[PDB]
Amino acid sequence: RSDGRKEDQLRPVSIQRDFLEYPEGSCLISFGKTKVICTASVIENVPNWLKGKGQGWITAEYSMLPRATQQRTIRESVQGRIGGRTHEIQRMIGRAMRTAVELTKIGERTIWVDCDVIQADGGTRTAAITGAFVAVADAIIKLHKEGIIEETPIKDFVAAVSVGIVNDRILLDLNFEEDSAAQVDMNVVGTGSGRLSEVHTMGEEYSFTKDELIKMLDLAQKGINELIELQKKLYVIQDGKWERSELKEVSSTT
Amino acid sequence: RSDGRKEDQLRPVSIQRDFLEYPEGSCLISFGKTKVICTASVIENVPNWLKGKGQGWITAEYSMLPRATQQRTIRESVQGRIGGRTHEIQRMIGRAMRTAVELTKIGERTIWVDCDVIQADGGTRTAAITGAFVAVADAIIKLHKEGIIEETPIKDFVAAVSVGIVNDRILLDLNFEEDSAAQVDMNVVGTGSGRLSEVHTMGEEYSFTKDELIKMLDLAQKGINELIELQKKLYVIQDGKWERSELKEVSSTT
Amino acid sequence: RSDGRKEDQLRPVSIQRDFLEYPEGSCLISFGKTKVICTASVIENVPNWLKGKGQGWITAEYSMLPRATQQRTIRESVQGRIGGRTHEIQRMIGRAMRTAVELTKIGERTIWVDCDVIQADGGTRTAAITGAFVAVADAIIKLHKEGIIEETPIKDFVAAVSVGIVNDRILLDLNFEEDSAAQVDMNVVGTGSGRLSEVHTMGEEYSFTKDELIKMLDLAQKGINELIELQKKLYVIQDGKWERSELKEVSSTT
Amino acid sequence: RSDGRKEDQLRPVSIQRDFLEYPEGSCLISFGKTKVICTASVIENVPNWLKGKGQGWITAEYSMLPRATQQRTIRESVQGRIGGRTHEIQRMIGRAMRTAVELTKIGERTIWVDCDVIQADGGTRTAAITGAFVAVADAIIKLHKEGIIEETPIKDFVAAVSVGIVNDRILLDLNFEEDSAAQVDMNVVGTGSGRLSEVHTMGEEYSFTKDELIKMLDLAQKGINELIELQKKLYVIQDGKWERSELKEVSSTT
Amino acid sequence: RSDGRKEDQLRPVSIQRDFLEYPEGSCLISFGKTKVICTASVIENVPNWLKGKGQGWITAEYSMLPRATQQRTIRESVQGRIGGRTHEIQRMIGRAMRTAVELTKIGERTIWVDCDVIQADGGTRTAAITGAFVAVADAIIKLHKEGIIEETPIKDFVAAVSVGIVNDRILLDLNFEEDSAAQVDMNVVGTGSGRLSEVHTMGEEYSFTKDELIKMLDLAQKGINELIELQKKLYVIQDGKWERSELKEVSSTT
Amino acid sequence: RSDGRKEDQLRPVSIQRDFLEYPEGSCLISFGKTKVICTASVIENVPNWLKGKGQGWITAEYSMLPRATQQRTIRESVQGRIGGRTHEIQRMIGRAMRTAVELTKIGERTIWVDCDVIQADGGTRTAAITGAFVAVADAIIKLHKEGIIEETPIKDFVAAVSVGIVNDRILLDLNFEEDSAAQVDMNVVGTGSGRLSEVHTMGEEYSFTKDELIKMLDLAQKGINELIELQKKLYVIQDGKWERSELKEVSSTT
């Protein structure tokens, strides 16, 4: 590989919690040059279609600072048109966070997740999912510690990774060059207990076989395991009770 | 199932070509109550980033008439905000059509695919992919017959189907009620030669196992086979040469 | 005329009711190559300025699929700017439907009319008015049959036709070439009892005389009569009681 | 009538030319409380579809200051959505100006007409057409005087008036109360030589007869004559040569 | 100076009240060729964040007719994007009006200020502030005279002027050419009692000294005094009681 | 003061350069809880109105992540309307950067400055100006080091600070509570050589005196001096030649 990384090998991962002071939960996560600030903020209200239904909600906002992929990514603000890509990813991130939380026990409140890509080199949405989880878990633990809620209703860890087929090679965690050069690429969202939350595989003018898909899904699930092993070092859990470990930062030894 | 259909059974499928006179290719396809007008029109130009590169292009526009799911689906016109869902599906449809055509041999022109959902009851995007293929193939055959291009550069058939897990049952081709009630659901885009172009599986606050995913991918590939067997009755192909059969309409015998 | 049609002669008209299953009323109407899907759906509510005023409402949405006039008509969605033309026609269609119904007796509900032009070759808005009436009448008859309302409060038939002056010839029902080549053209919306609901005459850089206008208004009213004679074959009316005839389709014998 | 005006009687009309210094042509016209600033500015260019075609163009922009009809008319700016009504009227005004000018002889330039309603009490679009003509004529006369063009290619005067049926009375030049209370109302755009440029008649949930339409078209044409007699006092024309009279202001004696 | 005006000399100022009939207050103010219609209209309501708080509000809308600076200033309507400049000025004008009124005593109602630039040649926002005050004062005096409110809660006069450094000369009240050619320019909003409400000084790629700023602020305050002396001729005030003088128009003698 | 800070005392300032790898220049600057990522990226092109004019350009984009002031600041993306506040600040930041650079010597290229507020507690735009300068200087030094340009055409340091009058106290560098509670507040943009680039003072329904303004401008200029003394520790300059010092981070000793 370009950067001398093995095919079934992730880039250097780094997750730093308590990145910012104001949000209930926050972290700066990085997969190589890809960097994402993930924050979780509690809004003491709920969408209207949920009112009175004894449940909370989680929603996500994603944004890519104009300086991404060492190119230009002008925001959906001072430009006009609003990309349907940003929404696709926001919906993804929201779906991952919601799958991981028992919203029943969160109360009639909303956790507003914000993923700000401050540097892009491929895999920015999976890095955002992986980091967003940390921020959401921390925010729920914070809410508990503040007595706003009884327990810490977090179902399981959640992480994501990309995998692709490049020049007929199956690669894990693609940077931006490998991804643009890919025949087939995909995104997997998995849980701590080894299950899956989402898998999107797309042929880029090339088609693939069911078996190629399984090979990829297998390498991805291994990537999710490594990412979740990192995430696990930040918590001390017992019988569904979540507390933060004393680590403020975890990183892959590579 | 609600409608008395088996679990591994599709709804009544119907594809009618030559639905309209003006487009090079067009059809009305239906999966049960879900109905979609698919048209393919040739625009004698190409996007700017493609100019001079000796290649053609295919792009898709999708729209859902205000009367969908027996509810309201006001267009992205007299409303303002533009859904990122419509774009997700348009990109999908475009990716499927492009995978199926050798754009190199189409010339510096663009095939504009339009999918108009005139009635929605689940699986509207897969019905659109299945129908869009027919319209695109017909348009390429038309272009050939008009002498605009030498051959009929169509690589293979392309169809799509949805599958899901509902009350722990794995169901094929979900209508709107089964889909809203689903724990896990997915969309598969496959080719005539049995390969895959795209697969998107999403847990709806439930997670699934790799094996459950394979079971689903297996039922889906069988659905794609049936859909492609229908599509095949509309063409007579030999050594990469495509002509239309004399059928103007094909339907599953159910 | 280009198509060998007399000057005071309409193109082949065709109206097919029950085109779709979900809407209370629906039809596919065609004036030559111009084709429009017209549906009428009941929304169990009313605009706010009408609440509590013991009255119902009718509103229309019009849209022209990207493949119109064998050219490009990209929707007011994935483009941005919203044409003031679409609104002009929607307001027109709404005004025609409302003139024909005694909204007092419809209840505090709204009939949402949707006109989807699936093929355009001139006269698409008059075809939409003519077809929209059928869909609205059917929807009111349906509402009655479902016991939602007591009577079938339809005041009279409503249809529309275009007429123009081309190379100093006064022509009825203009296709797209005759219209672009016209010095003066107009749209008339008339009722079954021979009255008028709307008439818009526009000089296209040419001016006309009051007498030329009367000649045109006269030919148009004859076109409305023929269109209404077709529409009449679809209903059996007596003392303000409306039922559908057994025809599912009516067409001009030409 | 509310204001003691006869039925076939206009409100006090006033046209003041040279209202502003910067535009080639400009005036403040008033029909009762309805007041409109009309300016005509020359832009030394043409729309792209006209380039090289040896012709000029005229286009109009209409706007209604937030304080109209003694109510609120917030602009299509700090609100978002853009009304399809403003466009309907802009297209109307542009069509009237273009019908009156021989664009062939104007050169490859554009006359930008701006109608700013500074006070609204009915008939604001007809007042704008009547006033816009004065501004356009003046601008063409100015262009001639500056030697930019050879002749003053103005075909004829152009004015507009509204008429309606209120409580079964046919009234000329409706203010805002008469218009809201009208069963039928219309707008006529006529020329100096007694011809017509545009006529739009709309039943407001009431239908009318061809003869009622003629009665209205007759009263309107008389209103156009009076308005054009005022406009004529501002020019001295001979053999298609236009010069301004010494009047800076003209008003109906009432 | 270009127009033969001294450096510490304003252009000819003119303020005409009762410009229009419908608004509670209105005037046409002019600074040289720069002309602005300023109207004040009472809306019998308040923004939601103010409800029940026993206070009124003042908000402003600013717009520049397409014919400004003898160039093109197409509105924020039939263009799309909405300038952040118009908002900057609207907020400014609103802040000036609010500083001058004791909103506590105005009641739970809103004064809607509209500034319509009908001709631009520099200093259009300061002319708008100066004129808007007159319209607001008149509207409050009107409200009092109609018995809607007890007193006339106007704190003090408010006016504005621009000043700049051009070719190292400090000039008062810049027209459009002096402003575009300026190294430093600013806007001051002052009160009758000689105080300040707002001051914005901007280096245009040139920086300035604190002392240069004071020199400018000094010339500006003198310009505000002259403008307020004009404004004062339109009112007769005593012990916080405001009545209009018999002047309908005031102008600088120059 | 709330946080025990003196009145003429800044919050703890921190500037970290080389914050990110991809941009030519970048830093994370902080004024208390207010934190802003400032990046400078070179775009090898120029706006059209500048082409061929032998000059470069600098433009800025500002954005406030949804989690600001421990509240909600949803971007100008998935919301619709685009704030005129963001533009006011972007224009400000661009004006400050341009005043500090000799664009003549930068070449026909553009420096794209991006200020991303990742945490807001008052003074976010002044923190952005102060930090943006560092990123721009670094980017120019980088461009020089890469041989793209001959010299390092930076005219002088540029920094900004806010000051206000709160409960009649004149305070330097206001946090969010002091600012909302302020009678008068302002923003000053000054240079290393002690000059000024911009000063905006606004009465918040209170007016102030010229002398109060001078007192404030005096405290602000002292704040700019301290901020510039920090900035200076990051560079080693001689005869207009700029190199970076070995500091990667500088902070006020407080």
Short mmCIF file of N, CA, C and O in Angstrom, two decimals, chain D residues 38-77:
data_model
loop_
_atom_site.label_atom_id
_atom_site.label_comp_id
_atom_site.label_asym_id
_atom_site.label_seq_id
_atom_site.Cartn_x
_atom_site.Cartn_y
_atom_site.Cartn_z
N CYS D 38 -42.13 53.70 -11.87
CA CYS D 38 -41.74 52.89 -13.02
C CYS D 38 -40.47 53.44 -13.66
O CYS D 38 -40.47 54.56 -14.11
N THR D 39 -39.38 52.66 -13.69
CA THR D 39 -38.15 53.18 -14.26
C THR D 39 -37.67 52.32 -15.41
O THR D 39 -37.96 51.14 -15.46
N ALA D 40 -36.95 52.91 -16.36
CA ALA D 40 -36.44 52.13 -17.48
C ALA D 40 -34.96 52.44 -17.60
O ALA D 40 -34.57 53.59 -17.74
N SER D 41 -34.14 51.40 -17.50
CA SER D 41 -32.70 51.54 -17.55
C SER D 41 -32.08 50.71 -18.65
O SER D 41 -32.43 49.54 -18.86
N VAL D 42 -31.14 51.32 -19.36
CA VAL D 42 -30.50 50.62 -20.45
C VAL D 42 -29.27 49.85 -20.00
O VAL D 42 -28.38 50.39 -19.35
N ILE D 43 -29.26 48.56 -20.31
CA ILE D 43 -28.13 47.69 -19.98
C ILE D 43 -27.51 47.39 -21.33
O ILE D 43 -28.18 46.85 -22.22
N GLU D 44 -26.24 47.73 -21.47
CA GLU D 44 -25.55 47.53 -22.73
C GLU D 44 -25.23 46.10 -23.09
O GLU D 44 -24.13 45.80 -23.55
N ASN D 45 -26.20 45.21 -22.90
CA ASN D 45 -26.01 43.82 -23.25
C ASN D 45 -27.35 43.17 -23.51
O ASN D 45 -28.39 43.83 -23.43
N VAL D 46 -27.32 41.88 -23.82
CA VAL D 46 -28.51 41.11 -24.15
C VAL D 46 -28.45 39.70 -23.57
O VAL D 46 -27.38 39.19 -23.26
N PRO D 47 -29.62 39.05 -23.37
CA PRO D 47 -29.63 37.68 -22.85
C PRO D 47 -28.85 36.82 -23.84
O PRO D 47 -28.81 37.15 -25.03
N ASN D 48 -28.25 35.72 -23.38
CA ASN D 48 -27.45 34.86 -24.27
C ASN D 48 -28.17 34.26 -25.46
O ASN D 48 -27.59 34.16 -26.54
N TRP D 49 -29.42 33.87 -25.29
CA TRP D 49 -30.16 33.28 -26.39
C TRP D 49 -30.46 34.29 -27.50
O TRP D 49 -31.03 33.93 -28.54
N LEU D 50 -30.08 35.54 -27.28
CA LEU D 50 -30.32 36.58 -28.27
C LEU D 50 -29.06 37.10 -28.95
O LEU D 50 -29.14 37.68 -30.03
N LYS D 51 -27.91 36.91 -28.30
CA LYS D 51 -26.62 37.35 -28.84
C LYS D 51 -26.51 37.18 -30.36
O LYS D 51 -27.02 36.21 -30.93
N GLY D 52 -25.86 38.13 -31.01
CA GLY D 52 -25.68 38.07 -32.45
C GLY D 52 -26.92 38.06 -33.32
O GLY D 52 -26.81 38.08 -34.55
N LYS D 53 -28.11 38.04 -32.73
CA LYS D 53 -29.32 38.03 -33.54
C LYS D 53 -29.86 39.41 -33.96
O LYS D 53 -31.03 39.54 -34.34
N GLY D 54 -28.99 40.42 -33.90
CA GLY D 54 -29.39 41.78 -34.28
C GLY D 54 -30.72 42.25 -33.71
O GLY D 54 -31.57 42.76 -34.44
N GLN D 55 -30.90 42.11 -32.40
CA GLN D 55 -32.13 42.51 -31.75
C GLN D 55 -31.88 42.92 -30.31
O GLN D 55 -30.91 42.48 -29.69
N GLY D 56 -32.77 43.75 -29.77
CA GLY D 56 -32.64 44.16 -28.38
C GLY D 56 -33.69 43.44 -27.55
O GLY D 56 -34.44 42.59 -28.04
N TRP D 57 -33.75 43.77 -26.28
CA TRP D 57 -34.72 43.10 -25.42
C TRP D 57 -35.27 44.05 -24.34
O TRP D 57 -34.68 45.09 -24.06
N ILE D 58 -36.41 43.68 -23.76
CA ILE D 58 -37.02 44.43 -22.68
C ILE D 58 -37.47 43.38 -21.67
O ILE D 58 -38.08 42.38 -22.04
N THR D 59 -37.15 43.60 -20.41
CA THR D 59 -37.53 42.67 -19.38
C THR D 59 -37.98 43.49 -18.17
O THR D 59 -37.48 44.58 -17.97
N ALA D 60 -38.90 42.96 -17.37
CA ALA D 60 -39.39 43.71 -16.23
C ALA D 60 -39.27 43.04 -14.87
O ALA D 60 -39.36 41.84 -14.74
N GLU D 61 -39.07 43.86 -13.85
CA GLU D 61 -39.00 43.40 -12.49
C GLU D 61 -40.09 44.15 -11.73
O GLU D 61 -40.20 45.37 -11.84
N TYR D 62 -40.89 43.42 -10.98
CA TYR D 62 -41.99 44.02 -10.24
C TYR D 62 -41.79 43.71 -8.77
O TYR D 62 -41.30 42.64 -8.40
N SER D 63 -42.15 44.65 -7.91
CA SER D 63 -42.01 44.40 -6.49
C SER D 63 -43.02 45.18 -5.70
O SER D 63 -43.36 46.29 -6.06
N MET D 64 -43.51 44.58 -4.63
CA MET D 64 -44.48 45.29 -3.81
C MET D 64 -43.99 45.55 -2.39
O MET D 64 -43.99 44.64 -1.57
N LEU D 65 -43.58 46.79 -2.12
CA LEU D 65 -43.10 47.19 -0.78
C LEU D 65 -44.00 46.64 0.31
O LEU D 65 -45.23 46.68 0.21
N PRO D 66 -43.40 46.11 1.39
CA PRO D 66 -44.12 45.53 2.53
C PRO D 66 -45.41 46.26 2.98
O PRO D 66 -46.29 45.64 3.58
N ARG D 67 -45.52 47.56 2.69
CA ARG D 67 -46.73 48.30 3.07
C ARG D 67 -47.69 48.48 1.87
O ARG D 67 -47.74 49.54 1.23
N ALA D 68 -48.45 47.42 1.58
CA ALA D 68 -49.41 47.42 0.47
C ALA D 68 -50.78 47.04 1.01
O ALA D 68 -50.89 46.26 1.95
N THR D 69 -51.82 47.61 0.40
CA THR D 69 -53.21 47.36 0.81
C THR D 69 -53.33 47.62 2.31
O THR D 69 -54.09 46.95 3.01
N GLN D 70 -52.57 48.61 2.78
CA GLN D 70 -52.50 49.01 4.19
C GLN D 70 -52.23 47.78 5.07
O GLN D 70 -52.57 47.76 6.26
N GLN D 71 -51.59 46.78 4.47
CA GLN D 71 -51.24 45.53 5.14
C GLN D 71 -49.74 45.26 4.98
O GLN D 71 -48.95 46.19 4.81
N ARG D 72 -49.36 43.98 5.03
CA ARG D 72 -47.96 43.58 4.91
C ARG D 72 -47.67 42.80 3.63
O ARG D 72 -48.33 41.80 3.33
N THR D 73 -46.67 43.26 2.88
CA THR D 73 -46.25 42.63 1.64
C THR D 73 -44.73 42.49 1.64
O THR D 73 -44.04 43.05 0.78
N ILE D 74 -44.21 41.75 2.61
CA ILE D 74 -42.76 41.53 2.74
C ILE D 74 -42.20 41.01 1.41
O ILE D 74 -42.74 40.07 0.82
N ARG D 75 -41.13 41.63 0.95
CA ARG D 75 -40.48 41.27 -0.31
C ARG D 75 -40.07 39.81 -0.43
O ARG D 75 -40.05 39.07 0.55
N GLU D 76 -39.75 39.40 -1.66
CA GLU D 76 -39.33 38.02 -1.93
C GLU D 76 -37.84 37.89 -1.57
O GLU D 76 -37.10 37.12 -2.20
N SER D 77 -37.41 38.64 -0.55
CA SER D 77 -36.01 38.64 -0.10
C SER D 77 -35.79 37.97 1.25
O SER D 77 -35.43 36.80 1.33
#
